[model samples]
Target chain A: ILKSLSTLITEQRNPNSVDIDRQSTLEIVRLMNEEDKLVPLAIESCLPQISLAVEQIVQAFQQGGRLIYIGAGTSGRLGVLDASECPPTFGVSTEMVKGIIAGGECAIRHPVEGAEDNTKAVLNDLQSIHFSKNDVLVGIAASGRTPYVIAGLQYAKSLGALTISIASNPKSEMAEIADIAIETIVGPEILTGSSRLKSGTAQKMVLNMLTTASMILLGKCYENLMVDVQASNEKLKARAVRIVMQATDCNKTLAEQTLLEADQNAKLAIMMILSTLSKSEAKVLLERHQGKLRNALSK
Target chain B: ILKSLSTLITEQRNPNSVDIDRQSTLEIVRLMNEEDKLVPLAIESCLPQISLAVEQIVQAFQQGGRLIYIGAGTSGRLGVLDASECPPTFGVSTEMVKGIIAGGECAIRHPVEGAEDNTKAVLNDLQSIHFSKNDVLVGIAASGRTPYVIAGLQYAKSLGALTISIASNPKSEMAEIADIAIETIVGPEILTGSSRLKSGTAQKMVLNMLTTASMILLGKCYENLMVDVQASNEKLKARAVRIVMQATDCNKTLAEQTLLEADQNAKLAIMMILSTLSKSEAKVLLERHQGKLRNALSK
Candidate 1:
């Protein structure tokens, strides 16, 4: 229990912030800002690997498969966070992207004792989800050595699923076992071993790209417009009108008029304006293109 | 429901990413990375405001007050995420930092319909926690027009609580209502109206700074060392050994010995080793200094 695991780069002390306790409030936040600037640059180095993993994810989605994220602690919460946003942003079903944290949903707000080390719990989590080979599993852990995540990745591999690992360390066990390893080596956190600072931010960026880029590849957007946004609230309902307007370059009146005719479907409304099709004709065209605006327009 | 809320900058489209749906996977992520690089710079402009808010947070802590975070959607999730990390990082009770998202715990994974628009729900959430004037409240919203969060800020103000607002747009209603407003004007999202992208990341960064800087000022940290980490798992237990060794410049064996004597407390172990005090003597000294490592050494 008292063994040292400082061999990992993330556990190492940042020389610049060794005196953080002695700094003023302004200096402390400034130092944190300086450290944060390095995260995006570090992520830039992992773009190739991220692109590769996203390719697999898109393929999985095409085959009627899900993208499942599994992790512990901050990494787990991030997976859940990104997964939760998919339905509202892309108007996909909740099952399309799922997030499973160790110790279940309760772990989201409260730290569950030894949840990260409970490797057995992840098996139950995966089994409960009805996980299959067609799915893509993204195992997230900044340390890249969490037993729960490592076990999940190994189990995912055995099931013939595509396994992607995101971590802050290279040459780690999780990275080695993963089919596609996306490592964002954010040097060190301002507070030693507090990977929730820099590492958590990097994981969030990666998770966002994994979902957004893949969904875009699957035609969830049209010309960077969120045409698939679910109007679950007043703001989003208003947003759908604007999205239709942008996608078709139409006025608000035309967008709203067409949106109503298309049953409030922004993508369908955009297709109607662009292709000059009736509601039924545009609906069929969108279906033929699998609800993809650009495909419907081009074809 | 069909009104245009595109007046906010976050809802506007990015000209650079207009053809994202037509781009390759690498190009798509590359474009996202370019936008991500701008986030830290956007936050850099608001560091002074963030510093000011953290000062109020620390003052509240000193007066036996809690730091409360309230928001909706992605903003709400970021608030909860930051609050959840406080206990494990700073050894504070869960009550010291609280996060209330619209629609409650289920909203963490699922978007509750019309939850953000329910201004009455926040009053219940705040009152349920027995919120008082001593608490410092941070209201987070990217577009700065969330009715729920605006009501929360107003309610807290009526109770004489310190109110801080974080948003992305300037000259917004929430900013005006907050005593200290921290705005990170991150520009348009890749997918228009998808504030979950850059806006969400900015909020996370700001939230991380608020709690971290405030806790550090309260002496929860010892010279950038996480002296208060709760060893809830195997990795954290191992981290305690390393933390004690680094703080006192002791070898692994001596650090482990002192840590055992100090009942697995890295801070106490560091104190015992540096001051050559017995475990009980160092314990008394640490308590006298309010568990502050530097204060005990000096006084």
Candidate 2:
């Protein structure tokens, strides 16, 4: 009804699931799994675009720019989920990565009426964060044409910010507006128009790369270890100790003691072990290399 | 460090990604993508348990009980993300599905310090919603041993609720505590212990089935179409009209006109088209069959 949805691949019905309602529970879930298996392949073709986006994100990180994910509905929630994990996973500040859902935080749990169509709300939401040209804005929408997301991407581009769009639709209008377009071609969902299924998985994969690959490029990790991991909880604290032990060939007891002395900073603890530096001295060494553990040790 | 994390498969080092930090942006994303493709397979073995959970959820729905997802960090966020999408996807009541995250709603966007370790918080959070035995509780944890989730599952079991655990580790303590265990073997994450990657995807897939299949079984769908989709926004409203058109073999004009007359209810509009009934009489017909469009039409 709104601009010929039939043309949109995301809105098309799936032939594989024409009689899904008549299937048994196991058959239903198995069908969903079969559909789920195709998500990564849909993303495979977009790897180059995703890699390009990660490079731009890395560039933004070096310039002290934030990565902002803007979208409505499930796309918005996936952005929020990926952004939230950034802090604990890579020890980034909350401000470094942000997710602005169309209808605000409440929309994370409830569908805010008409939120996706509120183009004006996008401007206000972007402004509330004092978003500037230095920030990289990523617009996500399965249909690739949510008015709210399109407006946000357009506004970010107007501000001279690097903009990217991730959508499931091919030749999406939202993609045309962004600097980089990453489209995943997962076919129609098991349930018609429920892009939250496979489409969401593909988007989640892209968002994971936008942050993970970029953070790795930014030296937040060392040889696959999340060296910048913040020990915010017990499991993560355990991880911090394990990382210190793995990064340096140190014993568990030594890793635990050094981690505590380094204020639970895994990178600093590793630097202490590899370079034989004091806790205070390790801080200066890591800071001189801009928190790069491997660089600090090499120096 | 809590109970030898080394024993947990989730925390194992991924030899495939030992040099991930030394890889190119494309290489890094590709590695993650390759790892991501295995997520569905990890969940494949758990379909039976997932199917069982769906059956229990449908039973609970029939008995007027809710489906509650409880977890912490990425698991919690995924649960919240999956739960939030149910209403818009199936036109289900918000109370019919719920996500309880550790550290409350704030934890949805930010990790709460030691929230997963604070077992007492689980009791208060569940009690806040008056969670009951009649309900089905699904506990999510990638590590398979988040104290908060373990406590919640144990508590729910104490109240005679149907308890399920979705975890990635084999023979997880979280699994042992639940009535049903769905363990996905995703091997290791690209970022070592960052379970938010594959483990999160696996959890999301299971959560999707628990809600989607259960809702389908509950007669919220007809021939793979979500007949009860909530028209929450412009895009969803368009979908509602489109669904009516497809289900009843009507044109756009008729579907839109009938939709407006049926108070924007897609099922009601389709019923009107099939039975040639007035909006008021169609409502009665649908209500008599508990809003099951196919059931109401067959009679």
Candidate 3:
């Protein structure tokens, strides 16, 4: 057990931070900053696989299927964090994307004892979510060998679902069973065996790409504008108006008047202005084009 | 409202990603990768302030005070993400560090409408935790003016708590209220006003530094090793044995036997092996040094 554990790259100590405790505060953070710079560079090689995962996720969304993320600890929390942002940013339904931690919601705030080691626990979690082949599951684990995640990948594959694995080590166990494997080699952590640092950051960048790119492909945005954003708050409502003005090069009063006529729908407002359509006509055209403002405007 | 929103750096569009939706998947991700590389560089200037925050946090910890993080939206989630890992990685009690978000726990899994806009809600949330003057408060806001975080910093300062601010723009409103201000200029995000991408990543990196460096100063680690890890799971237990072996240059069998004798306490086990003390004596020495393995070994 000890021999195998010691061999993992994450468990190895970094030569740079060997005297971290004795260093000045500035020196400590400088080393950390240098190490953090490597995370995205390490993830560059995995972009092709990440793009593949995004394509599959977009397909699932178009079919009314959900994108689900499963993992433990930092990996689990990051998955949940990304999943939670879709509604406000892209105007997706709450159920469109879900995140399941090893020990359920309680583990989101505190570490549940031995949750990641309970390989069978994830099966029940998946069952409770009514997971089916229509869904896609992305298993996140920095160690690349978390028992809970490995079990999830295996079960997801058996259910005929498209499975994607995101890990920090190359040739990981989770990758072996996944349909698309994204291995981001972030090297050893500054603190030996603390995957929550560099590995967590890498996972976040990849998860962001998976959702951001997929949401864009789904027409949530129009030529880099977040046209589908939900204006449920002051900041977001203000953003929606700004997006309308930016899309049409219109003034504030004109943007607000059009937005009000379109019932605060930025995409519909832009479609009406650019295509010279009435409110109802613009709505119909947008719906016909699957809510893509660019397509409706061109028509 | 649109005027105020446009003035915020986080709310502006990225000239680099204006045609992001029209690009190939490879090109899109490549652009994202390039933007991600800028985050660390943005943080380089803030390292001095980050170090100052760490110094204050270490002092608070030594005085038996907690490190509390407060924010809203993506910023809030990142705080919770960093706080949740402290217990598992450093073997600290749950109360040692805390993360609070606007709209309470419900906002963690989904966006609670108009939550961050309510400035007074955070006061009640802090009162619920019995927040005191001895503790440290870190307010995270990518926009640099989240009403919830601004209120949190003001209230925490009134209570004589050391207040620190982490924002993505220079000369932020929150910075004025905080004792230490860490402004990381990540520039415009790829998705135009998607602060959750680069801004969120920068906040996560800074939060990681605060906890990791402070824990190292508090002796949670020994020469870059996570010497205080909780061996509550199979993976952790295996790592514990490996840690003991690495610290003492002992054989696996000796490490296993000593770990059992110390009741699975990795620090105590290493102490016993190096100092020729019985398990009970090692515990006494460790306690004398406030659980610091290095100080105990030296005496």
Candidate 4:
């Protein structure tokens, strides 16, 4: 089964790297940097589809659906990495965005042999998480044909979920299963099939896009300020005050007082300072507008 | 303490993103892409230090010393990410490269409160791993002053080990503590204080170089082939056969037969075919050359 996969572009040897080991350290790194420069360009061709996927994700969020990321190995770890950042950055519920990896959490730090080939395991994993049609699943596979990811996407699509695939090669099996397929085409890796290099980096960039853009659309920010940021630690608490100051050009004292008055909520504090509304009134207005601070302040 | 640290470049607001929340999706994505483009360039300026660090890492490997990365949150996760890929990609033992987070294994998937601030925790963690002067330590922090990472670097340095620092800000505390400092100034992130964005990407690129370039120097690769690859699965097994084919210019049948005869070891198989030696002889010769396939074949 895997022998036929050798024809895939991702599996093919890179002509430019036929003598990489013979180069000087500086020359080898230069070649790697040159190859890395092509990753963003490859992503540029997939922007429209990425944007569409973000739009869909925002809609799903508004409809009480979560954004789910699924993959195997490096792809799975990247998915988990992106998912884990949302709560601290946006003050969202931990359940709003989820990441499921093949072979479970142990695989994050170690490779799980044959974990990606157990196609039926994904269904059990998804079921454990209560995955449903209300969620959006982003299936990631650099080769575009990991059995675990393909099976997960199939299950998600059958449940009428919005499915997106992020792959490094075009016409991937995962792409065929997805509603929005983002084929990045980063070409062959410098180490010849070590997809963890350029391919993994490309996947990270796209996952960053999917979550960042969608969170912004969901009103997680106000004029680039992380308004909903949770002051979980001292750094974030300082950031909260700074966010208020940045949004309204207020002094630190004023920002701190307003944040305290608004129960340490940066978004509500900003709204209270910008508009002639009480803290409770500001919260109501924000809720009415679905957390869009701009709309609430305009009102 | 964290409040005073907020003045770091990694925590500063980006004036360009002052009105990002109101922009259209395409505009928002364009801004992100423009910022993402700067990451690789920031790394370019640190190439000399990066190359120096790789040289140090290869020396450590040759001496049977391990490379250990220590950090908190995103930095720690990125370190783990780079380390986990090494064994399968280059077929090295897991002990050769390691990543340790501040809050133990649980921090990999979720934020561990005040984990980065637990300065004493790293000392305990390193002790458990039997860290010694022979090991190399890399302290990763976007802010360049996470207490946990600082403590780890201090411990490693006190033991007379090589220490490297990967930080996003210039003149970082981590830089001051290490022999080689790679400060990648990616400027302010699109989301203010979101070091997980640009800063994290910069860290990823640098870590990739540390491992990729160091592995190349350690003779883990032959030309462009991942000659030390572990054929743990269907895809990797095929990759092993292909690596042999690519290295020796043999047809598929010959490559497959030789790989089986050589116990499916890409390096051993290639040596068998290219040096007119039995698998046992090739293994002994490879060991004699410290696993440098080129050197072993020439002998």
Best by the lDDT measure? 1
Candidate 3 residue-wise lDDT, A1-299, digit = tens = 33586567877889998888778888989999999999989889888888888888888888888999998988999999999999888877899989999999899998788898887799999989989899999999987898899999888899899999998777878989999999989988999988999999999999999999988877789888888788877888888889988999887677888988968788888888878789999899888888767677763
Question: Per-residue lDDT of A54-106 in model 1, one digit per residue for the tens?
Answer: 99898999999999999898999999999999998898999999999998989
Evaluating just chain A, the predictions reach TM-scores of 0.97, 0.97, 0.97, 0.97
TM-score of 4: 0.97
TM-score of each predicted structure versus truth: 0.97, 0.98, 0.97, 0.97
TM-score of chain B of each: 0.96, 0.97, 0.97, 0.97
Docking outcome class, model 2: medium
Clashes of 4: 0
Fraction of true contacts retained by every candidate, in order, equals 0.90, 0.85, 0.83, 0.59
Candidate 2 residue pairs in backbone clash: none
Model 2, first chain, TM-score of 0.97
Clashes of each: 0, 0, 0, 0
> By TM-score, how accurate is candidate 2?
0.98
How does model 1 fare in lDDT? 0.90
TM-score of 3: 0.97
